[PDB]
Amino acid sequence: AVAQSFNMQQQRRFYEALHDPNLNEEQRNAKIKSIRDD
Incomplete structure (x- = not known):
């Protein structure tokens, strides 16, 4: 594909970052x- 490293595995931490309001904007965008990138 275009690259596709560990994005599929990371999908859960990605979902967590995106959805979870406790993680602030900086934390979220950093994770995303x-x-x-990976």
């Missing part, structure tokens, strides 16, 4: 970015 790192996951998309």
Whole structure:
């Protein structure tokens, strides 16, 4: 594919970051970015 590293595994931490309001904007976007990069 375009790359596809561990994105599928990370999908749960990705979902967590996106949905979870307790994790603030900075935390969320940092996780999202790192996951998309990996």
